[PDB]
Design a protein around this nucleic acid. Structure first.
Ligand SMILES: [Mg+2]
Ligand SMILES: [Mg+2]
Ligand SMILES: [Mg+2]
Ligand SMILES: [Mg+2]
Ligand SMILES: [Mg+2]
Ligand SMILES: [Mg+2]
Ligand SMILES: [Mg+2]
Ligand SMILES: [Zn+2]
Lengths: 48, 152, 43, 108
RNA sequence: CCUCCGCAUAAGCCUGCGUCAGAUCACUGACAAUUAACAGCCCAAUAUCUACAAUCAACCAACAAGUCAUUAUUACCCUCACUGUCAACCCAACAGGCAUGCUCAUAAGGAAAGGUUAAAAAAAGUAAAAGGAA
RNA sequence: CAGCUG
RNA sequence: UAUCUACUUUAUUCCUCCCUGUACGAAAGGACAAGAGAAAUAAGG
């Protein structure tokens, strides 16, 4: 009955756990991308 | 003119003072003892004792869980506030923290303070003791108390 | 004061050894620097 | 504006040596009874507070070793134990932070 | 908590937060590094050819009329050298400027607060009774 | 002109 | 971007009303003063 928030890092902090969580929100956009052109447009756009 | 202005103005706005104090309060729920500069500490001391008074309102209370959700930036401390700190202080009604002064900070010579939460596992602070009851003045006054009790 | 907007092509083409020797006046520029005793006669 | 004349060292010495600019001899200063290094009243002893700070530093290091990783605040009270001490009957249902030195005279 | 910033190439600069050591709001000495496929660095003559833009090019639509090409004979047999590759960087100022490709809020990059108090005056922002250029 | 606005 | 001098807490008025539409004048006319009011400004809160 106790509604504890989930123990995760934050999305906006300047830490190293928070960065991994930002990586997960990018990847979560890939999982929810419908067509394969969308997925391949996400997985290749940041040119490093 | 600041008559009856009760809040320090801090940080770089009202929002930023509430985020500074929220970081100090998060630090003190986590570590149970903090050195920080003095004005920041007593501002946050006001907020700290209120936060336990929301911790005693029960885990199941919705308003308490909203306040704990805001005020504790690390979410693992919200089980600590409702199962460690609030059961610890379930007897006494106030005075959950103690604040003392440290010597001034070496860097910029700021007035420094410690607050801890009372009754924590950490080594105790060198608390300022009153003088012994067996001193000269305290024995004269003890004798005087014995005489004024002898009036009845 | 960003009057100097550098490139090496303009620098060697303007003031290099070959442009200095291309004219008689420029040869006299080199000769004056050689007589003052300078470490850089040109670019 | 700019200064009309140059101030002299007689005027200057009267300015920067009057008692509003001198350092006040303070007299809060006592001797800490426990350590004998002189402290100030109304302020904790620097020395004894440095003792307590260093021991909370070792204890928090071992808290960090027994937790492992961030976001591991236990829902249990904690007890610090030193070498050769049984956990008491009161210490049951509390996580235990074993130390490697002796129990100090001032920790209790 | 910001992010109108980033990451690369270009131009520029030329070892300029690598390791070891030391002196000095709180540089000197030693050592080590940038490895070519990317990019520069090209071309055997002598003749002779090159009327019909580009624009999703399809028509349609035009005028300001356009950025791209060979053939003939002769000579020709060895082969992967040389150079660039670093950085927190340049031109200024003691604010600004900067070509191009991607990312268009970021996976990348960062911090507006030395500590306090909360006077005046000044700057900026927000709110303002009734009135609405007086 | 009407409207808004320290 | 203030160096020097100097400096930084020394109750009026209008309108109304009354007295009075009396005094005064002889008719026209028509008081003062004092009082009550309501305003406004300034001064101090
Ligand atoms: Mg290639
Ligand atoms: Mg590079
Ligand atoms: Mg980042
Ligand atoms: Mg401030
Ligand atoms: Mg400051
Ligand atoms: Mg102005
Ligand atoms: Mg208004
Ligand atoms: Zn002491």
């Amino acid at each position: 009955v106790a509604r504890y928030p989930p123990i995760v890092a934050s999305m906006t902090a300047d830490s190293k756990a928070a960065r991994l969580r930002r990586i997960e929100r990018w990847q979560a956009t890939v999982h929810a991308a419908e067509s394969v052109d969308e997925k391949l447009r996400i997985l290749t756009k940041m040119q490093f | 003119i600041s008559h009856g202005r009760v809040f320090r103005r801090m940080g770089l706005g009202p929002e930023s003072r509430i985020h500074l104090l929220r970081n100090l309060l998060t630090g003190l729920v986590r570590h149970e003892r903090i050195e920080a500069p003095w004005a920041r500490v007593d501002e946050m001391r006001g907020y700290a004792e209120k936060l336990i008074d929301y911790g005693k309102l029960g885990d199941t209370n919705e308003r308490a869980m909203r306040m704990a959700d805001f005020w504790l930036t690390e979410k693992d401390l919200i089980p600590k506030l409702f199962q460690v700190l609030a059961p610890r202080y379930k007897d006494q009604t106030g005075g959950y923290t103690r604040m003392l002064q440290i010597p001034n900070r070496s860097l910029d010579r700021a007035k420094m303070a410690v607050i801890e939460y009372k009754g924590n596992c950490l080594p105790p602070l060198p608390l300022p003791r009153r003088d012994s009851h067996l001193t000269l003045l305290n024995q004269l006054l003890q004798g005087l108390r014995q005489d004024l009790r002898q009036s009845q | 004061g960003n009057e100097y907007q550098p490139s090496n092509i303009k620098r060697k083409n303007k003031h290099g050894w070959v442009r200095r020797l291309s004219t008689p006046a420029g040869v006299q520029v080199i000769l004056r620097r050689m007589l003052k005793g300078r470490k850089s006669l040109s670019h | 504006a700019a200064p009309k004349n140059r101030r002299t060292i007689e005027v200057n010495r009267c300015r920067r040596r009057n008692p509003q600019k001198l350092i006040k001899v303070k007299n809060n200063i006592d001797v800490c009874p426990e350590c004998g290094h002189l402290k100030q009243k109304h302020v904790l002893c620097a020395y004894c507070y440095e003792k307590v700070c260093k021991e909370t530093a070792e204890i928090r290091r071992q808290i960090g070793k027994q937790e492992g990783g961030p976001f591991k605040a236990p829902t249990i009270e904690t007890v610090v134990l030193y070498t050769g001490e049984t956990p008491s009957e009161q210490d049951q249902g509390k996580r235990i932070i074993e130390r490697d030195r002796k129990r100090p005279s001032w920790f209790t």
